[PDB]
Design a binder for these strands. Structure first.
Ligand SMILES: [Mg+2]
Length: 141
DNA sequence: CCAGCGTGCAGC
DNA sequence: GCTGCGCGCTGG
């Protein structure tokens, strides 16, 4: 399952191979523009390349990175706990994890697994991708 | 100038 | 169901 690239360039399209990273991206984009968030995301993944590492992080360090994005303390603590549960808790869908809601979940079920037909998103960008996909899937296979 | 917004979410 | 978290960007 390789979700296709779209004319809307959701960052999920390039991060689907690694659900932890895709899901971290969703968190980064919580009421934050991609213009601001996505450059910080690469710095974050540089310092914390995986959930194995991130769940050991000092949340104050993470907060320093998030400072320009707003929601810096909330999200930094969420990121460390989310990463912890991602690896340690039994889950089937990541909505079961702290810090992931419907939008993150929908992103997961569209990009990381082949369940896009079953998803009913309520997020504007995601709907654009998801609607577009219903219209072009036969054409793309 | 500065109010509205940004690919939300958990807690209550 | 509502609210707090929160910065920089935007555009009249
Ligand atoms: Mg959750």
């Amino acid at each position: 399952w390789t979700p296709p690239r779209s004319p809307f360039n959701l960052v999920q399209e390039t991060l689907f191979h690694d659900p932890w990273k895709l899901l971290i991206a969703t968190i980064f984009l919580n009421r934050t523009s991609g213009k601001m968030a996505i450059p910080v995301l690469w710095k974050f993944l540089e310092k914390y390349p995986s959930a194995e590492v991130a769940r050991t992080a000092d949340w104050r360090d993470v907060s320093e990175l998030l400072k320009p994005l707003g929601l810096y303390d909330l999200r930094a603590k969420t990121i460390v706990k989310f990463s912890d549960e991602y690896l340690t808790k039994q889950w089937k869908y990541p909505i079961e994890l702290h810090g992931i809601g419907k939008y993150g979940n929908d992103s997961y079920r569209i990009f990381c697994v082949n369940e896009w037909k079953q998803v009913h998103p309520e997020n504007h960008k995601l709907n654009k991708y998801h609607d577009w996909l219903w219209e072009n899937h036969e054409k793309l296979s």
